[PDB]
Amino acid sequence: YQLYRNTTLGNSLQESLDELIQSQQITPQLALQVLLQFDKAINAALAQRVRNRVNFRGSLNTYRFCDNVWTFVLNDVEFREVTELIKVDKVKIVACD
Amino acid sequence: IVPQLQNIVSTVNLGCKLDLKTIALRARNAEYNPKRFAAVIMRIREPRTTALIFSSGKMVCTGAKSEEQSRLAARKYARVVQKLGFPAKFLDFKIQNMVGSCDVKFPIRLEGLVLTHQQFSSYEPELFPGLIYRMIKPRIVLLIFVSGKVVLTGAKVRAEIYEAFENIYPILKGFRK
Amino acid sequence: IASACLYIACRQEGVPRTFKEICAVSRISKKEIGRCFKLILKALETSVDLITTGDFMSRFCSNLCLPKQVQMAATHIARKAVELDLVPGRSPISVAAAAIYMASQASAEKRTQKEIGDIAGVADVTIRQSYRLIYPRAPDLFPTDFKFDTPVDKLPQL
Amino acid sequence: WERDGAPSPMMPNEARLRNLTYSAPLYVDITKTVIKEGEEQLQTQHQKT
Amino acid sequence: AQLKFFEQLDQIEKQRKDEQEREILMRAPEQLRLKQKAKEMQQQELAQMRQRDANLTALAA
Amino acid sequence: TVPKLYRSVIEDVINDVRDIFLDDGVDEQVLMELKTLWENKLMQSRAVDGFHSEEEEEPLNSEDDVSDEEGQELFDTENVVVCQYDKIHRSKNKWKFHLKDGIMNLNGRDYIFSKAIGDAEW
């Protein structure tokens, strides 16, 4: 899934690549090959890099189910994980199966 | 006792071919999953209503609790659809089914009714707890539970729900515990 | 259809067997049997009969090997309860099992609700609820020809 | 087995009067194991069949 | 660098073999091809579920 | 415990793509430029500290105004949540969410969960 490319980590990577492409220091096609490697690497790290669980509540606005991916947008929603609690009045949730 | 309407299901034709995927991406509160069902489910908060907007341009609206509320909610859905930009028309806002509920306020003996009215009434304890008294002269299916709540379903117009309850009221009054 | 024909014949013989029982011998869901049943009633245009608790007093008490006196006591308890409509809700089998329970609890042949529940198939809470409905009249529901093994006062609560 | 499915022991005299047959039911214990080498040998038994 | 052009001609040859593949599909596999297309459409258009976030980010970044 | 995971992931990814860069005909200097470009953007953003940084019937105009603002949904700075779903459920207007493996950014802070359970009325 080329899902995690528009994240801080993924975008900083693309920007770095574009420069190298711009200066012909680094070029495309190769760039695509690097991104492909990134997909495998980020996916692999997520599924087996550990994790911690919790439970919470919310209010809704729009929803979307396309290509087995849910995209929600909640309003006035606060989520608490373990000790920490985070308030929010606009949160977007993208979820893959 | 006066029965109170609980659901109005209506069909209104928008008049033109609609691309379902485009509607789902831009409209708010809109779900479209092709595998489970073939229509966009759209709802609105101001008048509670869940509407399936079909691909060929036929729209079915459900969840409204009165006639005027259903026409207004369908008018609302048509405009939500128009503002996207598809050509839009409003045609034949016709009510299909109205479900109404009421309480006689007295305990009722279902078993007795089956004995003297086996022709129009069918009751099986295992399948469902309540007798169904399908009535022919006013076409309505009335479900009577033992406690006394009667739910009337299938009436295309407001008068039928009221007329059937008045017609079934003497029979229940006779079998009153 | 075969299974539905079977349920009907038992009723036609005045000795219905529960769908739960009928399910035991078939793959068909109770719902599909009930739906097919309705269709047959409509198909063959024929009426049916209402169930009675006593029709199942025999085999269940038999399955518990309960003596006729308990069996018969239960039947009265059940019979009296329905005539008084003490339980205008619970299924008559559920009502019957609690009567059987009450009866068994009125004899040395006491059994746990779960065992009875296991035999009848009903939920153990459903008997407990049905029991709660019949318990107010536990003493007077018994037949006049009975010999307590436990006082009605000493009848357990649940 | 009576007409409505309630069992009762038959005495040898009723067998003569009602043209019955004097017999006794027969049971057995069967055990069933599935062997698919599916990383598990699943066995189960149905006793008194 | 002439080897890359030879490889592109070989890829055009691979695109051919695919037309014979179509003839084999017609004689008989079509369901499997449809399932593969459905799996692709999921991945391709879900990277689109992903990219709305990208346009919105580049808007303020 | 979050900057740590990120370092961890960046290291693993960088190490794991080295051969690919090499197989594609690339100088190790480019790899280091990548790491630098990458690390630097986060420092510039300043969302947290990093080790690297420190270094009639026909017209529908009769209907006047219902359909709320679509543009409200997108801010580009809105708390965004990347996670996986196990089960999403709905009854009438009651939704229940069963989520897992999620990275949250709430109020500016970063959080993570292996499982998240939520409730909302539409």
XYZ file of C-alpha atoms in Angstrom:
664
model
C 0.000 0.000 0.000
C 1.434 3.343 -1.137
C -0.679 4.478 1.792
C 2.049 5.936 3.995
C 3.748 8.180 1.454
C 1.863 11.345 2.415
C 3.056 11.303 6.008
C 5.831 13.382 7.551
C 8.317 10.505 6.988
C 7.078 9.761 3.467
C 6.884 13.354 2.244
C 10.284 14.370 3.587
C 11.553 11.399 1.569
C 9.845 12.438 -1.679
C 11.048 16.009 -1.308
C 14.596 14.794 -0.773
C 14.248 12.620 -3.876
C 12.858 15.410 -6.053
C 15.865 17.573 -5.228
C 18.252 14.817 -6.266
C 16.125 14.438 -9.380
C 16.174 18.188 -9.922
C 19.966 18.402 -9.636
C 20.194 15.166 -11.729
C 22.184 14.112 -8.622
C 19.470 11.546 -8.476
C 16.989 10.624 -11.262
C 13.415 9.098 -11.628
C 12.454 5.425 -12.459
C 15.125 4.808 -9.778
C 13.023 7.111 -7.599
C 9.991 4.912 -8.247
C 12.056 1.874 -7.293
C 12.999 3.569 -4.022
C 9.368 4.378 -3.208
C 8.465 0.768 -3.913
C 11.114 -0.271 -1.391
C 9.652 2.234 1.060
C 6.149 0.738 0.777
C 7.395 -2.727 1.729
C 9.485 -1.274 4.563
C 6.848 0.942 6.199
C 4.152 -1.734 5.945
C 6.461 -4.346 7.475
C 7.547 -2.053 10.319
C 3.967 -1.136 11.261
C 2.602 -4.662 11.564
C 5.531 -5.938 13.620
C 7.110 -3.051 15.572
C 4.942 -3.521 18.752
C 1.783 -1.518 19.892
C -0.450 -0.526 23.008
C -4.371 -0.498 23.301
C -7.321 1.665 24.712
C -11.095 2.653 24.324
C -13.006 6.061 23.808
C -15.982 8.134 22.191
C -16.990 10.811 19.463
C -19.486 12.919 17.194
C -19.600 12.500 13.314
C -19.907 14.568 10.059
C -19.024 12.739 6.807
C -18.047 9.091 6.080
C -16.565 7.246 3.043
C -15.918 3.567 2.141
C -13.828 3.223 -1.075
C -11.483 0.321 -2.081
C -11.833 -1.242 1.441
C -10.718 2.046 3.060
C -12.812 4.017 5.552
C -12.406 7.798 5.789
C -14.307 9.583 8.572
C -14.465 13.150 9.856
C -15.657 13.650 13.436
C -16.484 16.975 15.104
C -16.159 17.935 18.772
C -14.372 14.686 19.592
C -11.958 13.945 22.426
C -9.812 10.804 22.512
C -7.877 9.513 25.511
C -5.168 6.862 25.329
C -4.073 5.442 28.692
C -3.285 8.400 31.004
C -3.200 11.025 28.225
C -6.393 12.644 26.916
C -6.634 14.715 23.733
C -9.509 17.093 22.959
C -10.552 17.868 19.386
C -13.376 19.557 17.422
C -12.288 18.298 13.937
C -10.484 14.982 13.311
C -10.057 13.018 10.082
C -9.682 9.241 10.316
C -8.354 7.102 7.476
C -8.489 3.371 8.135
C -7.335 0.415 6.034
C -8.649 -3.079 6.746
C -57.251 6.185 21.078
C -55.656 7.924 18.018
C -52.793 6.037 16.259
C -49.552 8.056 15.692
C -47.591 7.682 12.375
C -43.996 6.401 12.883
C -42.536 5.919 9.320
C -43.212 7.331 5.817
C -41.453 5.629 2.850
C -41.659 7.641 -0.426
C -40.300 7.362 -3.996
C -39.423 10.488 -6.053
C -37.903 10.486 -9.530
C -35.078 13.028 -10.052
C -35.526 12.589 -13.854
C -31.917 12.024 -15.058
C -28.961 9.559 -14.997
C -26.724 10.086 -11.911
C -23.075 8.961 -11.505
C -23.084 7.434 -7.991
C -19.298 7.560 -7.323
C -19.111 11.350 -7.906
C -22.024 11.964 -5.478
C -20.376 9.901 -2.697
C -16.996 11.737 -2.816
C -18.420 15.309 -2.647
C -21.703 14.999 -0.658
C -21.418 15.081 3.164
C -23.015 12.280 5.291
C -23.056 9.971 2.204
C -22.148 6.222 2.178
C -21.730 4.232 -1.073
C -20.476 0.612 -0.870
C -21.163 -1.335 -4.106
C -20.684 -4.875 -2.739
C -23.352 -4.737 0.033
C -25.943 -2.645 -1.899
C -26.121 -0.688 -5.197
C -27.323 2.725 -3.922
C -25.913 5.800 -2.076
C -27.288 6.000 1.516
C -27.534 9.717 2.451
C -28.909 10.971 5.613
C -29.689 14.476 7.045
C -29.821 15.591 10.748
C -32.454 18.416 10.720
C -35.473 16.122 9.932
C -34.384 12.567 10.774
C -34.382 10.665 7.427
C -32.230 7.987 5.706
C -32.511 8.053 1.897
C -31.245 5.539 -0.671
C -30.465 7.505 -3.885
C -30.477 4.926 -6.749
C -28.113 5.054 -9.786
C -30.851 5.290 -12.482
C -32.389 8.393 -10.840
C -35.081 6.866 -8.591
C -34.837 7.982 -4.926
C -36.519 6.235 -1.939
C -36.757 8.291 1.354
C -37.367 6.691 4.820
C -37.492 7.594 8.586
C -39.751 10.723 8.392
C -42.542 10.811 11.050
C -45.253 12.794 9.163
C -46.405 13.479 5.530
C -45.234 17.099 5.229
C -41.898 16.176 6.866
C -41.296 13.459 4.181
C -42.111 15.762 1.258
C -39.802 18.467 2.685
C -36.938 15.978 3.314
C -37.185 14.638 -0.254
C -37.164 18.250 -1.599
C -34.014 18.757 0.549
C -32.254 15.633 -0.872
C -33.059 16.705 -4.483
C -31.365 20.118 -3.899
C -28.339 18.581 -2.076
C -28.028 16.537 -5.320
C -28.619 19.565 -7.625
C -25.986 21.805 -5.944
C -23.389 19.201 -7.093
C -24.439 20.089 -10.681
C -26.204 17.036 -12.194
C -29.402 18.143 -14.068
C -32.221 17.717 -11.520
C -36.047 17.452 -11.753
C -38.672 16.642 -9.057
C -41.484 14.271 -10.137
C -44.186 12.121 -8.441
C -43.413 12.460 -4.686
C -45.761 9.538 -3.841
C -46.012 7.941 -0.346
C -45.594 4.121 -0.596
C -46.075 2.813 2.992
C -46.892 4.330 6.445
C -46.478 2.432 9.767
C -48.528 3.617 12.786
C -48.536 2.563 16.474
C -51.131 2.914 19.281
C -52.046 1.327 22.643
C -55.590 0.065 23.398
C -54.646 0.486 27.149
C -56.212 -2.912 28.088
C -54.777 -6.492 28.284
C -55.880 -8.617 25.237
C -56.317 -12.441 24.877
C -54.679 -13.360 21.524
C -55.562 -17.085 21.825
C -59.296 -16.328 21.965
C -59.200 -14.170 18.813
C -57.667 -17.059 16.813
C -60.582 -19.358 17.902
C -63.444 -17.166 16.544
C -61.509 -15.510 13.671
C -59.269 -18.295 12.239
C -60.098 -17.157 8.661
C -58.442 -13.677 8.820
C -56.012 -14.189 11.766
C -52.822 -16.318 11.841
C -50.838 -16.815 15.109
C -47.862 -19.138 15.854
C -46.125 -18.696 19.254
C -42.655 -20.005 18.246
C -42.242 -17.938 15.030
C -43.443 -14.584 16.535
C -45.181 -13.540 19.841
C -48.024 -11.557 18.150
C -51.134 -12.467 16.076
C -51.392 -10.901 12.532
C -54.958 -9.864 11.604
C -54.644 -9.188 7.865
C -57.820 -7.210 7.099
C -59.353 -7.179 3.574
C -61.949 -4.344 3.450
C -59.291 -1.668 4.421
C -56.030 -3.360 3.222
C -53.714 -3.186 6.313
C -51.691 -5.817 8.269
C -52.181 -5.247 12.039
C -49.865 -6.961 14.566
C -51.411 -7.257 18.086
C -49.085 -8.113 21.025
C -50.428 -9.602 24.322
C -49.679 -6.403 26.338
C -52.054 -4.345 24.152
C -49.783 -2.343 21.805
C -51.168 -2.643 18.212
C -48.894 -1.723 15.235
C -50.745 -1.022 11.916
C -48.663 -1.296 8.695
C -49.161 -1.032 4.900
C -51.481 2.003 4.740
C -50.863 4.199 1.637
C -52.858 7.116 3.183
C -53.416 8.589 6.694
C -57.144 7.715 6.867
C -56.603 3.941 6.440
C -54.482 3.659 9.638
C -57.266 5.344 11.673
C -60.137 3.427 9.997
C -58.601 -0.023 10.592
C -57.984 0.659 14.319
C -61.641 1.721 14.755
C -62.727 -1.458 12.871
C -60.541 -3.799 15.031
C -61.460 -1.986 18.286
C -64.789 -3.834 18.888
C -63.158 -7.295 18.439
C -60.488 -6.508 21.094
C -63.162 -4.970 23.377
C -65.048 -8.307 23.232
C -61.939 -10.380 24.200
C -60.819 -7.896 26.908
C -59.477 -9.849 29.936
C -41.096 -29.223 3.520
C -40.560 -32.759 4.822
C -39.651 -31.358 8.246
C -42.648 -29.004 8.145
C -44.912 -31.875 7.104
C -43.510 -33.660 10.161
C -44.283 -30.822 12.590
C -47.823 -30.663 11.186
C -48.505 -34.403 11.448
C -47.562 -34.387 15.133
C -50.037 -31.546 15.636
C -52.464 -33.456 13.416
C -51.967 -36.384 15.791
C -52.441 -33.963 18.679
C -48.862 -34.501 19.842
C -46.678 -31.691 18.410
C -42.900 -31.845 18.665
C -40.954 -28.639 19.092
C -39.169 -27.138 16.107
C -36.149 -27.292 18.396
C -36.723 -31.074 18.421
C -37.521 -31.017 14.685
C -34.299 -29.072 14.170
C -32.374 -31.829 15.993
C -33.296 -34.208 13.160
C -32.862 -31.722 10.280
C -30.472 -29.101 8.875
C -33.260 -26.617 8.297
C -33.310 -23.465 10.398
C -36.365 -23.095 12.646
C -37.101 -19.888 10.665
C -37.135 -21.672 7.261
C -39.276 -24.465 8.761
C -41.697 -21.866 10.143
C -41.772 -20.028 6.799
C -42.282 -23.280 4.854
C -44.909 -24.244 7.463
C -46.879 -21.051 6.779
C -46.582 -21.686 3.058
C -47.962 -25.215 3.479
C -50.867 -23.977 5.604
C -51.561 -21.556 2.777
C -50.726 -24.200 0.152
C -52.999 -26.914 1.545
C -55.551 -24.482 3.018
C -56.029 -26.227 6.371
C -56.207 -25.005 9.976
C -54.162 -26.082 12.996
C -54.444 -26.353 16.779
C -53.043 -24.554 19.820
C -50.445 -26.265 22.010
C -51.046 -27.652 25.491
C -48.421 -28.047 28.230
C -49.591 -31.514 29.347
C -48.661 -33.039 25.964
C -45.000 -32.646 26.968
C -45.391 -33.392 30.643
C -45.166 -37.089 29.665
C -41.773 -37.404 27.875
C -39.865 -34.674 29.778
C -40.911 -36.090 33.183
C -40.090 -39.463 31.593
C -36.662 -38.145 30.566
C -36.308 -37.154 34.227
C -37.908 -40.477 35.212
C -40.259 -38.487 37.440
C -43.176 -40.424 38.954
C -46.678 -39.788 37.584
C -47.728 -38.040 40.800
C -45.110 -35.333 40.244
C -45.875 -35.372 36.513
C -49.618 -35.039 37.214
C -49.067 -32.393 39.896
C -47.038 -30.348 37.419
C -49.854 -30.660 34.859
C -52.403 -29.254 37.341
C -49.960 -26.527 38.357
C -49.535 -25.739 34.665
C -53.275 -26.094 33.972
C -54.237 -23.876 36.908
C -51.602 -21.287 35.929
C -52.840 -21.000 32.319
C -56.527 -20.884 33.306
C -55.574 -17.970 35.547
C -53.233 -16.631 32.851
C -50.557 -16.154 35.525
C -47.952 -15.997 32.769
C -49.334 -14.001 29.807
C -46.035 -13.932 27.925
C -43.645 -16.830 28.469
C -43.916 -19.794 26.105
C -46.104 -22.566 27.569
C -43.126 -24.959 27.444
C -41.107 -22.434 29.446
C -44.087 -22.117 31.769
C -44.427 -25.916 31.870
C -40.753 -26.483 32.707
C -40.968 -24.087 35.652
C -44.100 -25.902 36.799
C -42.147 -29.144 36.409
C -39.322 -27.439 38.302
C -41.709 -26.284 40.999
C -43.209 -29.782 41.060
C -39.772 -31.425 41.182
C -38.928 -28.865 43.887
C -42.074 -30.020 45.680
C -40.818 -33.612 45.598
C -37.609 -35.456 46.498
C -36.893 -35.591 42.776
C -35.504 -32.056 42.755
C -33.379 -31.043 39.781
C -31.338 -27.989 38.922
C -32.857 -25.523 36.475
C -29.874 -25.965 34.151
C -30.581 -29.707 33.814
C -34.273 -28.988 33.216
C -33.262 -26.075 30.995
C -30.958 -28.474 29.168
C -33.816 -30.919 28.644
C -36.347 -28.287 27.530
C -33.763 -26.229 25.631
C -35.046 -22.956 27.062
C -32.733 -20.429 28.703
C -32.030 -20.981 32.399
C -32.948 -17.341 33.029
C -36.222 -17.792 31.110
C -37.218 -20.533 33.538
C -35.982 -18.311 36.394
C -38.191 -15.497 35.035
C -41.104 -17.883 34.477
C -40.515 -19.214 37.972
C -40.644 -15.670 39.345
C -44.038 -15.348 37.638
C -45.472 -18.574 39.080
C -43.789 -18.379 42.510
C -46.363 -15.943 44.020
C -48.928 -18.749 43.704
C -46.599 -21.719 44.241
C -48.604 -22.959 47.270
C -52.115 -22.679 45.805
C -51.129 -23.857 42.305
C -50.484 -27.378 43.539
C -53.187 -30.031 43.183
C -55.360 -30.884 46.192
C -54.066 -34.450 46.011
C -50.393 -33.900 46.766
C -47.775 -34.852 49.354
C -45.069 -32.257 49.926
C -41.412 -33.196 50.282
C -40.661 -29.546 50.908
C -43.003 -26.840 52.261
C -44.078 -24.190 49.740
C -42.612 -21.706 52.214
C -39.328 -23.560 51.772
C -39.538 -23.450 47.987
C -36.299 -21.813 46.751
C -36.176 -18.393 45.077
C -34.333 -17.348 41.925
C -42.445 -46.477 22.608
C -45.970 -45.150 22.949
C -47.925 -43.381 20.224
C -46.629 -39.959 21.307
C -43.026 -41.009 21.931
C -43.035 -41.656 25.679
C -41.178 -44.887 26.518
C -42.241 -47.447 29.106
C -41.057 -50.981 29.972
C -43.203 -53.627 28.301
C -44.157 -56.660 30.298
C -44.234 -60.056 28.557
C -48.017 -60.223 28.847
C -48.815 -57.073 26.866
C -46.517 -58.410 24.154
C -48.894 -61.355 23.810
C -52.120 -59.366 23.989
C -51.266 -56.449 21.690
C -49.239 -58.526 19.195
C -46.082 -56.628 20.118
C -42.500 -57.871 19.967
C -40.286 -58.425 23.004
C -36.986 -56.728 22.218
C -34.388 -54.404 23.703
C -32.561 -51.419 22.181
C -28.862 -51.540 21.382
C -26.208 -48.824 21.649
C -22.499 -48.412 20.893
C -19.630 -45.962 21.312
C -18.070 -44.603 18.128
C -14.987 -42.402 17.904
C -14.145 -40.302 14.864
C -10.714 -38.847 14.133
C -9.960 -36.717 11.085
C -6.503 -37.203 9.599
C -5.467 -34.415 7.231
C -1.962 -33.772 8.697
C -3.269 -30.219 9.073
C -0.825 -29.727 11.950
C -3.478 -31.265 14.241
C -5.182 -34.666 14.624
C -8.787 -33.807 15.505
C -10.594 -36.686 17.198
C -14.107 -36.821 18.618
C -16.484 -39.506 19.850
C -20.244 -40.045 20.048
C -21.018 -42.506 22.823
C -24.198 -44.560 23.184
C -25.224 -44.348 19.540
C 22.375 2.155 -23.148
C 21.420 0.329 -26.435
C 20.523 -2.655 -24.177
C 17.641 -0.583 -22.642
C 16.138 -0.058 -26.158
C 16.508 -3.809 -26.826
C 14.652 -4.450 -23.492
C 11.825 -2.020 -24.548
C 11.454 -3.954 -27.855
C 11.296 -7.151 -25.724
C 8.518 -5.510 -23.565
C 6.551 -4.819 -26.808
C 7.074 -8.557 -27.587
C 5.684 -9.340 -24.049
C 2.621 -7.143 -24.825
C 2.117 -9.378 -27.926
C 2.190 -12.868 -26.046
C -0.590 -11.120 -23.997
C -2.890 -11.029 -27.126
C -2.337 -14.797 -27.543
C -3.178 -14.908 -23.785
C -6.526 -13.269 -24.739
C -7.207 -16.063 -27.308
C -6.472 -18.747 -24.627
C -8.742 -16.837 -22.181
C -11.573 -16.837 -24.796
C -11.163 -20.598 -25.508
C -11.219 -21.375 -21.731
C -8.895 -18.207 -16.241
C -11.171 -15.265 -17.260
C -12.663 -15.224 -13.707
C -9.101 -15.192 -12.237
C -8.158 -12.265 -14.558
C -11.308 -10.360 -13.421
C -10.383 -11.009 -9.736
C -6.816 -9.706 -10.390
C -8.279 -6.562 -12.066
C -10.588 -6.025 -9.034
C -7.580 -6.387 -6.650
C -5.620 -3.816 -8.753
C -8.530 -1.311 -8.877
C -8.599 -1.518 -5.056
C -4.831 -0.781 -4.619
C -4.688 1.908 -7.383
C -7.791 3.861 -6.236
C -6.974 3.455 -2.511
C -3.620 5.162 -3.115
C -6.151 7.832 -4.219
C -7.931 7.592 -0.815
C -4.355 8.234 0.429
C -3.561 11.259 -1.952
C -6.375 13.616 -0.859
C -4.217 14.016 2.274
C -1.224 14.905 -0.021
C -2.967 17.724 -1.919
C -4.365 19.098 1.357
C -0.843 18.974 3.006
C 0.991 20.663 0.081
C -1.683 23.418 0.479
C -0.030 24.510 3.785
C 3.550 23.093 3.775
C 8.955 6.944 23.213
C 7.857 8.349 19.848
C 10.983 10.095 18.561
C 12.638 6.773 19.373
C 10.313 4.774 17.122
C 10.826 7.256 14.309
C 14.616 7.056 14.599
C 14.207 3.302 14.712
C 12.112 3.275 11.540
C 14.267 5.785 9.663
C 17.377 3.743 10.482
C 15.787 0.468 9.400
C 14.403 1.955 6.187
C 17.670 3.685 5.280
C 19.647 0.522 5.974
C 17.147 -1.584 4.031
C 17.196 0.531 0.853
C 20.977 0.974 0.597
C 21.355 -2.089 -1.645
C 18.468 -0.946 -3.830
C 20.116 2.437 -4.341
C 23.382 0.656 -5.115
C 21.725 -1.803 -7.513
C 20.211 1.187 -9.288
C 23.668 2.799 -9.681
C 23.831 5.310 -6.817
C 26.620 6.888 -4.708
C 26.340 6.465 -0.958
C 26.562 10.258 -0.740
C 23.050 10.491 -2.167
C 21.838 8.190 0.599
C 23.255 10.569 3.198
C 21.655 13.519 1.433
C 18.322 11.697 1.752
C 18.757 11.246 5.486
C 19.761 14.897 5.836
C 16.900 16.231 3.694
C 14.501 13.976 5.656
C 15.747 14.827 9.152
C 15.873 18.547 8.361
C 12.240 19.014 7.343
C 11.029 17.769 10.726
C 13.425 20.127 12.497
C 12.187 23.031 10.385
C 8.578 22.184 11.211
C 9.391 22.032 14.922
C 6.514 19.703 15.913
C 8.849 17.888 18.275
C 12.582 17.621 18.956
C 14.949 15.272 17.143
C 18.539 14.155 17.665
C 19.420 15.079 14.081
C 17.979 18.580 14.484
C 20.113 19.251 17.562
C 23.290 18.337 15.680
C -42.860 24.285 -9.473
C -41.916 20.547 -9.599
C -39.471 20.959 -12.564
C -37.175 23.751 -11.090
C -35.239 22.716 -7.951
C -34.526 26.395 -7.112
C -37.756 26.200 -5.031
C -35.603 24.355 -2.445
C -33.423 27.172 -1.014
C -30.641 26.076 1.418
C -29.898 22.546 2.824
C -26.527 20.685 2.200
C -23.823 21.844 4.485
C -20.351 23.162 3.526
C -18.145 20.409 1.959
C -15.039 22.658 2.351
C -15.391 22.532 6.180
C -14.176 18.868 6.039
C -10.658 19.819 4.751
C -8.217 22.145 6.640
C -4.838 20.484 5.728
C -3.834 21.086 9.401
C -6.742 18.954 10.737
C -5.653 16.276 13.269
C -5.148 13.354 10.886
C -5.422 9.676 11.931
C -3.771 6.764 10.042
C -5.053 3.421 11.460
C -6.585 0.051 10.421
C -10.154 -1.091 11.024
C -11.216 -4.444 12.412
C -14.965 -3.836 12.475
C -17.112 -0.770 11.835
C -20.716 -1.071 12.973
C -23.929 0.979 12.711
C -27.526 0.654 14.087
C -29.922 3.547 13.243
C -27.571 6.499 13.857
C -25.317 4.727 16.383
C -21.812 3.909 15.162
C -19.169 1.820 16.935
C -15.573 1.703 15.756
C -13.098 -1.110 16.353
C -9.690 0.209 15.277
C -6.039 -0.893 15.535
C -2.426 0.085 14.757
C -3.030 3.812 14.789
C -0.897 6.931 14.902
C -2.699 9.994 16.229
C -1.797 13.668 16.288
C -4.156 15.387 18.722
C -3.781 19.051 19.688
C -0.268 18.916 18.262
C 0.981 15.912 20.201
C 1.619 12.444 18.727
C 0.036 9.251 20.096
C -0.111 5.555 19.172
C -2.443 2.631 19.871
C -2.620 -1.070 19.078
C -6.381 -0.894 19.567
C -8.944 1.897 19.710
C -12.654 1.561 20.479
C -15.039 4.436 19.893
C -18.681 5.527 19.915
C -20.495 8.266 18.045
C -23.978 9.391 17.030
C -24.215 10.642 13.459
